[PDB]
Structure 1
Amino acid sequence: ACYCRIPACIAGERRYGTCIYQGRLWAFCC
């Protein structure tokens, strides 16, 4: 399962991209 997160992906997740919604950028993390 993947999630959008700020400020960064948590340890144990990998960043696969950037989410752009609710007015800000998020890390897309899986």
Structure 2
Amino acid sequence: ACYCRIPACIAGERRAGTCIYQGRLWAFCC
């Protein structure tokens, strides 16, 4: 699956987009 993450994706994951949640920008990580 993919996961909204902050501050960044786990090494090896790809930032495939972004999430907006609780007033912050998250990386959408696949």
By the TM > 0.5 criterion, same fold?
yes
SS at structure 2 position matched to 1:4:
strand
In the TM superposition, structure 1's runs of 4+ consecutive aligned residues that sit over 2 Å from their partners are none
The sequence identity of aligned pairs, in percent, is: 97
Once superposed, what is the RMSD of the aligned Cα atoms? 0.6
**Deviation digits for residues 1-30 of structure 1 (CA, Å, limit 9, x no counterpart):** 000001110111000011011110000000
Number of paired residues? 30
* Alpha-carbon distance in structure 1 between the residues aligned to 2:9 and 2:20: 15
Unaligned stretches of 5+ in structure 1? none
Q: TM-score, normalised by structure 1?
A: 0.84
